[PDB]
Write a protein that binds this ligand. Structure first.
Ligand SMILES: [Zn+2]
Lengths: 1122, 50, 146, 50, 98
């Protein structure tokens, strides 16, 4: 019915029929921006459909802006235009495998013109390899999949700030004109009722100075401002009249110490304020100013800088606002409201996506290249110059290579599961280059503004220190061409709801009236109640008669992100816990064999199918050959296609990315139907955890304070085992004493150690390894004497080798284990591109099948995290009357405090879904079944259901369902009307005195595993510089002993323990060996020595010429030499 | 069962040509096999098909 | 000042140096990376800068140089030693390429990253371990699982 | 993994094992508790295996 | 740690500095570019500070642990543990008081 994806499993849902439109392509934010950048024809036709004219792409824009290039003489002219792209060099798969980027060549036709000769020359120019976004929105660099996240930046334009004086308590109004690029220019009003102007953060001089520098006369200024006396009083304090006077005064003020001239100040003032070369806004700036001042609304975008009319208009705006004027029309314009501009209002914060960022980097690179070409244009002679010798592509390629490699907006893709990547692609970040730092942000730029409704999701946000700065785009939001964020709406004319959908920005939503989508409506298309709830400007909400409501929203889930749209019963949970619930699905771990959840919210199907990690058939056909590695399908016309599937490939965070077919041979399929589910997917739906039978009761203290008790059945049937794949990399470079070589003959190592290697020197595939075992044998020559180039060349001509080696092999780090599954070997002599200086590079992959145990972290969907506390045997768990022991026991002291009551509801519904229900239809449908759709009247056992957020199952319906459930195979009803059941204690035997809550719950498995945290050390490697033990876990290091522990030890009066923890354990180079020998021999521990830190301090002091010596008790001198 | 050997394979995390399911699922299915025995020594069975 | 000088017992000659000591090598490491770029401490640069001018003065004394040039070089040597003991104490500080302020000897103590604090409060010890904790209710009050 | 320590050939794949044949067990008690010396418990034990 | 019941600081005179050091430094260069080894009388000279490799000299006459505390005649280095490279100091004789 409501499903649009072919072949998907049916999922009956509690809902009220809502279908103006379906969820848009969830990745259009990352895709259409780049499409516009390269100007692909699809973007062109989409723009033509939208109604706009003059289709110009980002590259075309920057190139037309750059053209033309001339010297000071103007004899020679150059220009570029019409950029074109070609086919990609190689498909994505080998780009991942061969560690080569995914690029396409870029060509531009360039023409050079010389006026004196009158001759032109045009030819094609290659300008590097432009990176290309794949089908899934992720760029590929050097074999790693990187993603570029959008940014939130203050929009260029004019802002009218208001302030209230401390003493006079008058309403002052200041203006600021923030440009895209140039020098700042703003107007100020003080308590003296004087109007002044500041340029480039200089002092205050009256705007009368600017008005006279415009060349205007006093009479004209009087006529323009004859309705205001504050302006007249401000002009009264003028120093002198005269255009030259204003020009010279401005020249002296801006640039003291410079010569005055009549003809100079005009030139530099014009350059600074009205010339595109130096000062320039953007398209958005002109659009915003035109919208604010309402001048030439139909004027197409031609200029991109200030006009005198703009300054006059903003002066009029300021003077009218300072005297409390309401409505203002600049002459020849239209009437617009007058009000202050909110700083963080979402009509002023602009979303610069990937396209604009890449365009900015391109503009910088071509600016550098244009500097170079201008420098080298005059140097060489005219008749012997061609553009090929004029353009050096070095800066452009350097810039586009550096931005990806370093800039804080090109981040590694998070590939824990499809949801993580999908949410990572749509993230909006307020930090980054050109934006405010972490310490610049205050409490005004973090909390939700009322204009976020429908644009930025207010619930999803990292819980760390970055809170508020990082947000997620809403479900239905799309970005307008300029960079603002639009939302859909329905058109309501007069109590009549239409199916036309109109997209609105922030300001249009401000200027109208809008109503919620859950307000009752009649089937004919009319409102029922006279007074409906309506949101209005400044966040006010009130009741209003139905005869003037402009717009009605689309769906109840219009304000939530994608991540938070997958939480059932979202409206029953507190916002604080919902944040943690939404921030834990981005941390799940794909399991060996996944299961679809019993109670979902319907969003997961679209989420999975747009995440791109599930292979979807492109064109209809039938299945010819289906095998675990590939699927072959013949189209209708007879053409064939073969889809290959990735098996056991490493993700970024160590998990496994595995794909399996679901279809079988001879099965007719339709275009768009899923055929091979990826990781964390079952039957094309986002599955992240399992369905566990849970009970809610404290239990003899093993689940005290957020612990969880699990049954051993989970470990038995491997319900929760995952797979982790680590990678190890070694590389042999060319030393100055010779050359390292992968060899099987390690110096003086017994063969039992070297049993598992082949002749090459690489561990055979499939041999289980352990810490301290050799993976790749390597030898590096010993520095006995530098080899003279004569002997080295003599031996290299005949290809000779000598016996001077020391072992530097690769061993499994402390803690790892598993089986080797794949070995990649790269060599320079085999025409493979490598970094300079190296010859052979070996990557060895070690895979291990983990299980669940103590310390592992589990979590439900509603942010009820916890840690495993004890894994009881199967017979110890309490069991129902039937005899099926529960799989997990929660705790009840944690529900009322956190107010995540929603999980309880879900638990009940889970059981109703598991055993199936059959409502009695005799004597008609009951009262509580009136609104319930007829699809849910009967259900088979373990049949999945849905529950959209801010809609869906109601308390009465659920209560009715709990009383009409089917019996089991033995004609018994295990649970009661309230939802509880009569458990039996399995440890003793007696039944529990009171019934307990039991149900089914969807439980995930977070990625904080114990086996990568447990760590121990008694005596291992020491650092060679500081004589302290190494750090980290892979280095077999020790634990930091912070100063707070030092205070805590001093508090007890403990002295010997502190001295020992600081002397013979850490950096007493003689004491440590002595204590080891004493312990291993059984004698008393000798006295501590003296730490190396103190001797270092003494040497540093003596190196400053300060004679420091250590005296004895009486006064006799002592030396610490030895 | 306690151990299996498959011709043409070395470890579990891989696949074999001509089979719709890789080795991991084969092991997972073979786990729930029901076998009854009385000899006190590790006995061996075979399974081949084409 | 003067009473302290008299009573303590100390030759004021310490205020004028004729033999500048040289810190050991290990406290100024010079490490060759695999990338071919020699990680060089700044102390080596300062020592080299001093020694060049000292040798030039030694060469100019025995060649009968005129008074003005030897005076200039003596001034330069004094400035070089002053930079060695404490960079940035006077005028334009000595800086390496990239406008990096060089680390002098006195920057081994002064500042939070100095020796007197940074390396003296906080250490890494042996015989230690770390793991995730879990509530266990069958223990007496003075026991811990391991 | 209790079986991988044998150090046998590279082809053998260790596999978990569930030796227990019993699948489900439950019980009920019928109590004759009328106040006399005639109080007793009848135990009904239900067993299902594989 | 022993009995350092007092610790006194004081100005160091030229005689004290001449007493501490184990030779003067005369070559401004730091380390040989090609040999990758320090040069004699340079900033890492083995004659002053000590041996770069334990129980060895530049010429390698006494390369064995048997000797201890004795100085080779050809190269004039002292055979002890490499740890001493963290202790010994040099000095520079100025030609004009500073
Ligand atoms: Zn020697």
């Amino acid at each position: 019915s409501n499903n649009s994806v072919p072949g998907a499993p049916n999922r009956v849902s509690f809902a009220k029929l809502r279908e103006p439109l379906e969820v848009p392509g969830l990745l259009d934010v990352q895709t259409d921006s780049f499409e516009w950048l390269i100007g692909s024809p699809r973007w062109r036709e989409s723009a033509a459909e939208r109604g706009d004219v003059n289709p110009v792409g980002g590259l075309e824009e920057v190139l037309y802006e750059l053209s033309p290039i001339e010297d000071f003489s103007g004899s020679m002219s150059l220009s570029f235009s019409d950029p074109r792209f070609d086919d990609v060099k190689a498909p994505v798969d080998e780009c991942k495998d061969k560690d080569m980027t995914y690029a396409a060549p870029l060509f531009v036709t360039a023409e050079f013109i010389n006026n004196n000769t009158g001759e032109i020359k045009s030819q094609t120019v290659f300008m590097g390899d432009f990176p290309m976004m794949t089908e899934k929105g992720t760029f590929i660099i050097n074999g790693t999949e990187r993603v570029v996240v959008s940014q939130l930046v203050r929009s260029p334009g004019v802002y009218f700030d208001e302030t209230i004086d401390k003493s006079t308590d008058k309403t002052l109004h200041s203006v600021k004109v923030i440009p895209s690029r140039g020098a700042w220019l703003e107007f100020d009003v003080d308590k003296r009722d004087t109007v002044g102007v500041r340029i480039d953060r200089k002092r205050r001089q009256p705007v009368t100075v600017l008005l006279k520098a415009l060349g205007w006369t006093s009479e004209q200024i009087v006529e323009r401002f004859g309705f205001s006396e504050i302006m007249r009083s401000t002009l009264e304090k003028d120093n002198t009249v005269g255009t030259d006077e204003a020009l010279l005064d401005i020249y002296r003020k801006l640039r003291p110490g410079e010569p005055p001239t009549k003809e100079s100040a005009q030139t530099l003032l014009e350059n600074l304020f009205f010339k595109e070369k130096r000062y320039d806004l953007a398209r958005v700036g002109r659009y915003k100013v035109n919208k604010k001042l309402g001048l030439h609304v139909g004027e197409p975008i031609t200029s991109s800088t200030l006009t005198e009319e703009d300054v006059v208009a903003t002066i009029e705006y300021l003077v009218r606002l300072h005297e409390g004027q309401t409505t203002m029309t600049v002459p020849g314009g239209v009437e617009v409201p007058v009000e202050t501009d909110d700083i963080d209002h979402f009509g002023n914060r602009r979303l610069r996506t990937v396209g604009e960022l890449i365009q900015n980097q391109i503009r910088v690179g071509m600016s550098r290249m244009e500097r170079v070409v201008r420098e080298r244009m005059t140097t060489q002679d005219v008749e012997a110059i061609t553009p090929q010798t004029l353009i050096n592509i070095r800066p452009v390629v350097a810039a586009i290579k550096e931005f990806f490699g370093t800039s804080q907006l090109s981040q590694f893709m998070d590939q824990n599961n499809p949801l993580s990547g999908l949410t990572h692609k749509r993230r909006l970040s307020a930090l980054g280059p050109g934006g405010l730092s972490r310490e610049r942000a205050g409490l005004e730029v973090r909390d939700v503004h009322p204009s976020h409704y429908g644009r930025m999701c207010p619930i999803e946000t990292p819980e760390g220190p970055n809170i508020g700065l990082i947000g997620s785009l809403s479900v239905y939001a799309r970005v307008n061409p300029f960079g603002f964020i639009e939302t859909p709406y329905r058109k309501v004319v007069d109590g009549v709801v239409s199916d036309e959908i109109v997209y609105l920005t922030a300001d249009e939503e401000d200027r109208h009236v809008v109503a919620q989508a859950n307000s009752p409506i009649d089937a004919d298309g009319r409102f029922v109640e006279p007074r409906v709830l309506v949101r209005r400007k400044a966040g006010e909400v009130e009741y209003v008669p139905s005869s003037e409501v402009d717009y009605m929203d689309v769906s109840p889930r219009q304000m939530v992100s994608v991540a938070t749209a997958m939480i059932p019963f979202l409206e029953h949970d507190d916002a604080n816990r919902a944040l943690m619930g939404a921030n834990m699905q981005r941390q799940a771990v794909p399991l060996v064999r996944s299961e679809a959840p019993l109670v979902g919210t319907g969003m997961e199907l679209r989420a999975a199918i747009d995440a791109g990690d599930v292979v979807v058939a492109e064109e209809s056909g039938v299945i010819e050959e289906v095998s675990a590695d590939y699927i072959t399908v013949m189209h209708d016309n007879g053409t064939r296609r073969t889809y290959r599937m990735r098996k056991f490939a490493r993700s970024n965070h160590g998990t496994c990315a595995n794909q399996c077919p679901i279809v079988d041979a001879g099965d007719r399929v339709e275009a768009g139907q899923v055929i091979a589910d990826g990781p964390c997917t079952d039957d094309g739906e986002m599955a992240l955890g399992k369905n566990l039978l849970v009970a809610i009761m404290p239990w003899e203290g093993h689940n005290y304070e957020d612990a969880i008790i699990l049954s051993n059945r989970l470990v038995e049937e491997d319900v929760l085992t995952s797979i982790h794949i680590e990678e190890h990399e070694i590389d042999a470079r060319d030393t100055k004493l010779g050359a390292e070589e992968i060899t099987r003959d390690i110096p003086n190592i017994s063969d039992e150690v070297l049993a598992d290697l082949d002749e090459r020197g690489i561990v055979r595939i499939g041999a289980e390894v352990r810490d301290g075992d050799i993976l790749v044998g390597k030898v590096t020559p010993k520095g006995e004497t530098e080899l003279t180039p004569e002997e080295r060349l003599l031996r290299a001509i005949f290809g000779e080798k000598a016996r001077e080696v020391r072992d530097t092999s690769l061993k499994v780090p402390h803690g790892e284990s598993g089986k080797v599954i794949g070995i990649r070997v790269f060599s320079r002599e085999d025409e493979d591109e490598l970094p300079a200086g190296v010859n052979e590079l070996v990557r060895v992959y070690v895979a291990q099948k983990r299980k669940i145990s103590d310390g592992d972290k589990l979590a439900g969907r509603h942010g009820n995290k916890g840690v495993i506390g004890k894994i009881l045997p199967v017979e110890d768990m309490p069991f129902l009357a039937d005899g099926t022991p529960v799989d997990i026991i929660l705790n009840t002291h944690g529900v009322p405090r956190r107010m995540n009551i929603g999980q309880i509801l879900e638990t009940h519904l889970g059981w109703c879904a598991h055993s199936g229900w059959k409502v009695d239809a005799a004597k008609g449908v009951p009262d509580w079944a009136a609104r319930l759709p007829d699809e849910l009247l009967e259900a088979q056992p373990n049949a999945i259901v849905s529950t959209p957020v801010f809609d869906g199952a109601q308390e009465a319906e659920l209560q009715g369902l709990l009383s009409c459930t089917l019996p089991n195979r033995d004609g018994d009803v295990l649970v009661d009307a309230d939802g509880k059941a009569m458990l039996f204690d399995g440890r003793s035997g007696e039944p529990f005195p009171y019934p307990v809550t039991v149900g089914y719950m969807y439980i995930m498995k977070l990625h904080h595993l114990v086996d990568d945290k447990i760590h121990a050390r008694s005596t291992g490697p020491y650092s060679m510089i500081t004589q302290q033990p190494l750090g980290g876990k892979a280095q077999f290091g020790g634990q930091r002993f912070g100063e707070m522990e030092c205070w805590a030890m001093q508090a007890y009066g403990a002295a010997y323990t502190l001295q020992e923890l600081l002397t013979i354990k850490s950096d007493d180079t003689v004491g440590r060996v002595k204590v080891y020998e004493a312990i291993v021999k059984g004698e008393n521990i000798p006295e501590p020595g003296i730490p190396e830190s103190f001797k270092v301090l003494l040497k540093e002091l003596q190196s400053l010429c300060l004679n420091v010596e250590v005296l004895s008790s009486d006064g006799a001198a002592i030396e610490l030499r030895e | 069962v306690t151990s299996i050997r498959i011709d043409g394979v070395l470890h579990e995390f891989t696949t074999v040509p001509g089979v719709k399911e890789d080795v991991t699922e084969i092991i997972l299915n073979l786990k729930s096999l029901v076998v009854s025995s009385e000899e006190d020594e590790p006995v061996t069975m075979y399974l081949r098909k084409q | 000042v003067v009473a302290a000088f008299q009573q303590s017992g100390n030759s004021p000659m310490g205020m004028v140096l004729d033999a500048v000591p040289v810190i050991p090598p290990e406290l100024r490491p010079m490490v060759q990376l695999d990338g071919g770029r020699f990680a060089t401490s700044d102390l080596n640069d300062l020592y080299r800068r001093v020694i060049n001018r000292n040798n030039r003065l030694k060469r100019l004394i025995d060649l009968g140089a005129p008074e003005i040039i030897v005076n200039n070089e003596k001034r330069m040597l004094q400035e070089s030693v002053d930079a060695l003991f404490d960079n940035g104490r006077r005028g334009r500080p000595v800086t390496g390429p990239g406008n990096r302020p060089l680390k002098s000897l006195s920057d081994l103590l002064k500042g939070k990253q100095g020796r007197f604090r940074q390396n003296l409060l906080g250490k890494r010890v042996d015989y230690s371990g770390r793991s995730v904790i879990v509530v266990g209710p069958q223990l007496k009050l003075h026991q811990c699982g391991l | 993994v209790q079986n991988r320590a044998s150090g046998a050939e590279i082809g053998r794949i260790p596999v978990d094992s569930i030796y227990s044949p019993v699948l489900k067990v439950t019980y009920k008690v019928d109590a004759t508790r009328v106040e006399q010396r005639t109080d007793f418990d009848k135990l009904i034990l239900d067993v299902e295996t594989k | 740690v022993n009995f350092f019941d007092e610790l006194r600081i004081g100005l160091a005179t030229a005689e004290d500095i001449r007493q501490w050091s184990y030779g003067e430094v005369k070559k401004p260069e730091t380390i040989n570019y090609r040999t990758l080894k320090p040069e004699k009388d340079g900033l890492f000279c083995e004659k002053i500070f000590g041996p770069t490799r334990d129980w060895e000299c530049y010429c390698g006459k006494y390369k064995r642990v048997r000797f201890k505390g004795i100085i080779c005649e050809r190269c004039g280095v002292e055979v002890t543990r490499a740890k001493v490279r963290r202790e010994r100091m040099g000095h520079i004789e100025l030609a004009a008081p500073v």
